[PDB]
Structure 1
């Protein structure tokens, strides 16, 4: 992890300590790139410092197209900062809710292929995410999706809820929920159900119904991610491979799962 000198970082705008959009001077002054800047305000506890720099240390181990790029940290000066590439379109769930209906099926499936490639990378590096959800995916100006936040019941596999057994296979369950979030343009999984009602339905065998305009193969794949027995779930390698095969033979995506008419209109 590169230690960045504060003279190289400018904060321009507040995004969301705080998160800033800013600029970073790199390569001995020869380049300048847009960045996101996350700060940790004075008064932070030892636990907060450990989680804060721990997320940067984890981010710093990864080098993959679909994982957010860490530029470096400012730890020797206060307030401390983590500095990443700037993702122009923000979080995936909020982005899709702003763009409802505006993308093609092929584009949505492409976003999922990217997320899945990022997760396959993570899982193969022996990292379990445990909080995989569209809110933790960021989107850049080219619609590339990247697993981004590394530091809730309705994304979590049953065995992880009840036994705290978090594995790559419980991340696959979460990825299935992310598939449903993407294909619905950011709907809330299980809608109005409370957490206890979500647990009730899942453990009874209920699963989220098909999104509108959803390829049958995509709904089949998310349903397989939600197998109760974790051993029956696809591996991330299977998911990437299937999505790749669908994108390369895109008429395969024209066969839609039936969208269940929840409402009677005659």
Structure 2
């Protein structure tokens, strides 16, 4: 089961429990790939006897306080509790004595929303469904561990060379269930609403949910019963599942295990996605 690292009297204890300390000299930074806390780089990590693995390296820019280090490292305390093929994997951390780092499996194709926009129209229904199935499997794992994501969005899904999609978080009214927006009720059931939004993002190749509508106009429309339509070439049964994820009454939304089951049926018989 997931443990909130902030139930720990000392935040550093959580870091040392769930995140392996790495030797800095075994880490090679190669290129900058992103700009919070510091730069994000790609590189390699040396493993004894094994070939080097490609990693993403999140750095803590120098001049930080004790306090800033704490919040940065909290992420490793969270990540390192998970072990699932559709949840991004923590290799480890450098916490003292050397430049502070979080070291993560490298995901070549980056964030799923930008990836899809770049490859607009290039994936078959079955391929897009495989991507959604991976995300759903990652969420099913997280939900079962008692972890509520709270910011599930295609921008928070990472893609590797093999098109495998993994749940991540880069640290959002249009992705959020109404009960979470209004009453701050964040649960796996509110993550299911977010997932429905992710489904829409994927089937539309990284279009912005609700396009140019203001946050207040999104909230109002949702309250009035508005729901986003099926994207171009999106089968009716996939859109129906989006509609199910977007039920006002959270108890009526499917569970992730049911979502995976439904997508599996679609991968097994592609025709059952239209009905």
Pairwise TM-score range, normalised by the shorter structure: over 0.9
Q: Does 1:74 align with 2:91?
A: no
Counterpart of 1:5 in structure 2 is 23
Structure 1 residue matching 2:52: 3-state secondary structure: strand
Q: Within 5 Å, which residues of 2 pair with 1:129-168?
A: 129-149=149-169, 151-168=171-188
Q: Deviation of residue 167 (structure 1)?
A: 0.3
Q: Within 5 Å, which residues of 2 pair with 1:196-215?
A: 196-215=216-235
Over 3 Å counting, the alpha-carbon distance change for 1:197 and 1:45 in structure 2 is farther
Structure 1: gaps spanning 5 or more residues: 257-266
Counterpart pick for 1:19 among 24, 40, 54: 40
8 A Cα contact 1:128 1:166, kept in partner = yes
Counterpart pick for 2:50 among 30, 49, 59: 30
Q: Does 1:118 align with 2:141?
A: no
The worse-fitting range, judged by mean Cα deviation, of 172-181 and 208-217 is: 208-217
* Matched length: 254
Counterpart of 2:123 in structure 1 is 103
Over 3 Å counting, the alpha-carbon distance change for 1:218 and 1:81 in structure 2 is same
Q: Deviation of residue 251 (structure 1)?
A: 2.1
Counterpart of 2:11 in structure 1 is none
Q: Distance in 1 between matches of 2:154 and 2:135?
A: 9
Q: Distance in 1 between matches of 2:107 and 2:78?
A: 19
Residues 25-62 of structure 1 deviation map (CA, whole Å, 9 limit, x = unaligned): 01x25331110000111233444323321111111011
Q: Distance in 1 between matches of 2:85 and 2:75?
A: 18
The worse-fitting range, judged by mean Cα deviation, of 3-12 and 39-48 is: 39-48
Q: Within 5 Å, which residues of 2 pair with 1:25-64?
A: 25-26=46-47, 28-64=48-84
Structure 2 residue matching 1:109: 3-state secondary structure: helix
Q: Deviation of residue 151 (structure 1)?
A: 4.3
Counterpart of 1:94 in structure 2 is 114
Over 3 Å counting, the alpha-carbon distance change for 1:89 and 1:2 in structure 2 is same
Counterpart of 1:259 in structure 2 is none
Counterpart of 1:222 in structure 2 is 242
Query: TM-score under structure 1 normalisation?
Result: 0.93
8 A Cα contact 1:42 1:78, kept in partner = no
Structure 2: gaps spanning 5 or more residues: 1-18
Q: Distance in 2 between matches of 1:165 and 1:189?
A: 21
